[PDB]
Structure 1
């Protein structure tokens, strides 16, 4: 498939197809030439590039089209289109001919270009993207159609989630020339010695056709050979562990040979680190970890949900400076670029599928037709990210109706799928909503870590921190009592805060209240032995749809959308730099 990150090797010619494409919101015949009347950038969200609300709110098919000159392709090579993602659905066309299709707006997929065109001068690539969401998609949307009484159908998507339905081609599109017989997947696992000084490496290299020899060379951060094998197994000594905010990455250069000549070559990075959840603790390299960080969003001005590597590094640098150590890919898999960056910077990542909105506005599980999309999402995510040492936990869903009948039957095989697919068998969790109190919830028994989204003082007991403190402490103790050996992580807690709003009277929406809210929250958290992590909502302000509770988007960010700090940022840096990354609160 297309799990492997696009690389430039001697056997793989990878070209970027980013830039300006002919664009159109509406119907189009791919047998016809899309004019240049409207253009659009790849990669980016198209929404904030539209000046009018009408075109910004567009729902349905929208087209990208461009004539691309064909490079040299040899006899033993094939040519594929590798999409980082297309949001949400896509049909791919080459010279008007349907050639590929994908559903899900946050996972990569590749599409084969017909071999009969490899000697043509040019090919026309048409991308039929679609941003419709319903009860069969992840994330879940409320779809509806209304006739404008002009004879036309106007589509509308009422989001079942708290973020703007940004759409377009958000991630790099690559034109890849690769051998027909190539490496399509590489799985790297390791068993650390008792003294943590040695490691037993296992490699699973998958090819689409037979090969005579699989040679694997391992290089350290000084690019020095530390091991080589033809048997896909290798013992290492004097190893250097991948540590929190102190990353060490090895490189596995995988070469396949046929008839004593190079067939294909690929390089996959990996890190040596151990993960275990036991006795109400989260262990990294056999030491108790305290999560400090953020729930994030792929969201910036202009680009919307589009990839911005500079934004990734800026955010992660701010994360490091504050004394934080982790973040969650809420509420969808982020770019591969972000994951690889997290690997390099030693940042812990809670990896998450777009399973948000599984909640009817009871009887949620008699209406959700998301099973197929949910299974694919888990399969794609694990296959894409399993080699990332930064990935330390999987999320099966964010705030589903886990208190309703049918919830357990829905999630039991999905939790199992994570365990079966992941070669590291990392802990999986479910991000719990406030309606599902310990007594009502019927799904948390399936997961390894209890993740809670709680807003005592904002949603419940609004502006009443006194009564809020009692409520949050009361429920946290209930969770600890119901699951005595499961670690607890707060994955969302915050208060909307507009920059410039001030008061001496602890007023919600002001910068002072955000400080007060978090100060109260932390006082409670520190008294719960099983609470091993705190991730705020959100890192930065982000765009949402139109509703009365949203004051031009979500303002629960510690930073503004332009990455400028709010008053509370200074307070978090004090706390997070006092609490070490390795912090045992069992003592």
Structure 2
């Protein structure tokens, strides 16, 4: 019988490279941990590019007698090396992938020193390093660490295969990985109900399984396989689901039904704390892509991400594209060996996730490299023949060793350039890009991003064009039968190197800001929701007379899953439907109100007084949404909106809390350049500065819980607002 327990609490952290065998002097920390907390903007991204040292005292326990004692590290950036009483026991250069330190043969009857040395240097021998990167990797032991006490003969892994999953009688085939020969018993479980069982050395089959359900994006049905070694007592469980995912030239199909893919790329970074955000924060990103942004797919730009994120995609029905750590650069032979190791470590950890339906085996936006990618493609196919292979490029006529030509197409809008005769084009035709006459599976894996940076507080007009651009691409993808779908660049604004973004160490490419608060472009994606799952209706306006050139709010884009939208202003009521002429292939084309529906004269257009407005959403002639705008917004409410009011007593939790400066009818004050002064008491600490800058009228913060019970109290203050307080009960 094994015992696993999270061992994040009680580490000691210090700058530099300390003697592994002596007690370390430094601060007590709770993992996940980021070595150097950064400002939001305009910082020296090399500040973390240096060595750090962590240490854990682990008392010997007599209940471990004759058992293996291991530490699993779920991830650390980077160049990791681990010592146990001064003796080195593993070293693992990669920053995105797990590694195990077997302590067993080096433990002594009292306290034991486990020392971990890391370095965040951009070491050219460790992918993705070697040159430029349009993201930051930070540093720290930014993922969980687990103390595992195992019987000698124990499970290290298992693979669950679902041959012929679309059948009324299903089959589960399981291939355990064990440390020595002997029986393995399996139980198929539906939560707590035992479906079937089998015992055997070798491959274990359960067949003739009736009444089970398919995993899909709508019904995320999961089952568990419990594995037991009857001789050693060991037990492990692996969730999977039953599902099929085929990339055919006619399109992507899920469980045999066609599905047009609609996704965003998502980094694993946050402001200030880098990658060191725990289970709860990881799970929240998944939920936001899936629900708020109503995507059926996410891409792990540009590395293996957290098991918590992937588990959460399993539990809520979000398809995943996961790739090896990369950003354009291909190092030497040895570098490529490590990239090939990365492929193995990515797929062996993640092969049971029904959410994962495609592997990225090229370095993102690399040039071609025949002998390198022959290797990555071969290895992926051997380790997992059940999923398609992709690998992201931004060039035409690329050598297609993989199953899907996964392409970043940035043609929108090149026609701005000076000697470009070609008209504004949202997406290229597949034959042009691939160079292959024969139809091949094809997925656009990024678009927009750097082609159209749009900051949270940028002008209404610019944000309109940003909205339009996500809409155009999504529409061209839904309209081209040869395009399996499209994945926008990108979910949120992210910190980058001095070589990218706006000089501020930020790429303003998100449809959401860096706190994952929507900008207007977000509801382009969210508005594709079916109405049964929620009404979305967001006008693309701040409702100010002279924000825009000339004045007025026409043309007004309304992002919505309503069948028609009503406009009331200045005694004019006008009902308008979704703009199908313009976005004919969108599931939920937006409503655009303009000169065709209302004239200048009607609204006293540029006849001096600014009026309030009301915008109502209609579904089958029934009013389902209402958005008011006042002519005269004034600071009315400083809203503190934590993602939860209640939390357990758990020091892994990073609680997101948004601050929004709101007028008399609850709209944000977009151009209020201001610091919200924040204090936090209770069992949690504020991450980042004490003063929070509004951008586009909102900003956000994460509060890392300490793990004690108590009440968190959040005070936010600004001289134009009433003092605002919020509490979250913990434990």
TM-score by length of 2: 0.67
Aligned 1:469-480 pairs, distance under 5 A: 470-474=424-428, 476-479=430-433
Q: Say whether the 8 Å CA contact 1:278–1:485 is kept in structure 2.
A: no
Aligned to 1:200, the other structure's residue is in SS state strand
Name the structure 1 match of 2:285: 315
Task: Give the CA deviation at 1:577.
Answer: 4.0
Aligned to 1:531, the other structure's residue is in SS state coil
Q: Say whether the 8 Å CA contact 2:135–2:496 is kept in structure 1.
A: yes
Task: Give the CA deviation at 1:330.
Answer: 1.1
2:167 matches 1:163: no
Task: Give the CA deviation at 1:427.
Answer: 0.5
Per-residue deviation, residues 179-223 of structure 1 (Å, max 9, x unmatched):
111111211112126x62121221112221232x321111113x2
Q: Say whether the 8 Å CA contact 1:326–1:349 is kept in structure 2.
A: yes
Paired with 2:437 and 2:349, the residues of 1 have a C-alpha distance of 32
Aligned 1:297-446 pairs, distance under 5 A: 297-321=267-291, 322-358=293-329, 367=332, 369-403=334-368, 407-424=369-386, 426-433=387-394, 436-438=395-397, 441=398, 443=399, 445-446=400-401
Q: Say whether the 8 Å CA contact 2:49–2:122 is kept in structure 1.
A: no
Task: Give the CA deviation at 1:408.
Answer: 2.0
Aligned 1:77-88 pairs, distance under 5 A: 77-88=67-78
Sort the Cα spacing of 1:483 and 1:94 in 2 relative to 1 into closer, same or farther, 3 A: farther
Paired with 2:23 and 2:103, the residues of 1 have a C-alpha distance of 19
Name the structure 1 match of 2:105: 115
Task: Give the CA deviation at 1:43.
Answer: 1.0
Sort the Cα spacing of 1:116 and 1:409 in 2 relative to 1 into closer, same or farther, 3 A: closer
Paired with 2:29 and 2:163, the residues of 1 have a C-alpha distance of 48
Name the structure 1 match of 2:455: 498
Sort the Cα spacing of 1:244 and 1:202 in 2 relative to 1 into closer, same or farther, 3 A: same
Q: Say whether the 8 Å CA contact 2:492–2:514 is kept in structure 1.
A: yes
Task: Give the CA deviation at 1:461.
Answer: 4.1
Paired with 1:187 and 1:306, the residues of 2 have a C-alpha distance of 29
Q: Say whether the 8 Å CA contact 1:358–1:368 is kept in structure 2.
A: no
Name the structure 2 match of 1:154: none
2:228 matches 1:266: no
2:176 matches 1:205: yes
Name the structure 2 match of 1:44: 33
Paired with 2:3 and 2:236, the residues of 1 have a C-alpha distance of 12
2:249 matches 1:284: no
Task: Give the CA deviation at 1:59.
Answer: 2.2
Q: Say whether the 8 Å CA contact 2:48–2:121 is kept in structure 1.
A: no
Task: Give the CA deviation at 1:574.
Answer: 2.4
Comparing 52-61 with 564-573, which one deviates more in the overlay? 52-61
Name the structure 1 match of 2:722: none
Task: Give the CA deviation at 1:226.
Answer: 1.1
Root-mean-square deviation (CA, aligned residues, Å) is 2.7
Name the structure 2 match of 1:76: 66
Q: Say whether the 8 Å CA contact 1:183–1:206 is kept in structure 2.
A: yes
Task: Give the CA deviation at 1:536.
Answer: 1.1
Name the structure 1 match of 2:159: 187
Aligned 1:250-261 pairs, distance under 5 A: 250-258=223-231
TM-score by length of 1: 0.83
Q: Say whether the 8 Å CA contact 1:352–1:395 is kept in structure 2.
A: yes
Aligned to 1:57, the other structure's residue is in SS state helix
Per-residue deviation, residues 369-407 of structure 1 (Å, max 9, x unmatched):
42211111011111101111111000012434335xxx1
Name the structure 1 match of 2:144: 172
2:128 matches 1:139: yes
Paired with 2:287 and 2:523, the residues of 1 have a C-alpha distance of 15
Q: Say whether the 8 Å CA contact 1:83–1:173 is kept in structure 2.
A: yes
Paired with 1:209 and 1:355, the residues of 2 have a C-alpha distance of 36
Name the structure 2 match of 1:230: 199
Task: Give the CA deviation at 1:177.
Answer: 1.0
Sort the Cα spacing of 1:462 and 1:40 in 2 relative to 1 into closer, same or farther, 3 A: farther
Per-residue deviation, residues 243-278 of structure 1 (Å, max 9, x unmatched):
1132111111111122xxx52111111111112222
Name the structure 2 match of 1:533: 485
Name the structure 2 match of 1:295: 265
Task: Give the CA deviation at 1:353.
Answer: 0.8
Aligned to 2:115, the other structure's residue is in SS state strand
Task: Give the CA deviation at 1:315.
Answer: 2.4
Gaps of 5+ in 2: 534-584, 586-731
Q: Say whether the 8 Å CA contact 2:39–2:272 is kept in structure 1.
A: no
Per-residue deviation, residues 546-572 of structure 1 (Å, max 9, x unmatched):
236434311111111112110112222
Q: Considering Cα pairs closer than 8 Å and 6+ residues apart, tell me whether 1 or 2 has the greater RCO.
A: 1
Name the structure 2 match of 1:449: 404
Name the structure 2 match of 1:555: 508
Paired with 2:48 and 2:119, the residues of 1 have a C-alpha distance of 10
Task: Give the CA deviation at 1:60.
Answer: 3.0
Paired with 1:320 and 1:253, the residues of 2 have a C-alpha distance of 29
Task: Give the CA deviation at 1:475.
Answer: 5.0
Aligned to 1:73, the other structure's residue is in SS state helix
- Mark the structure with the bigger radius of gyration: 2
Sort the Cα spacing of 1:523 and 1:339 in 2 relative to 1 into closer, same or farther, 3 A: closer
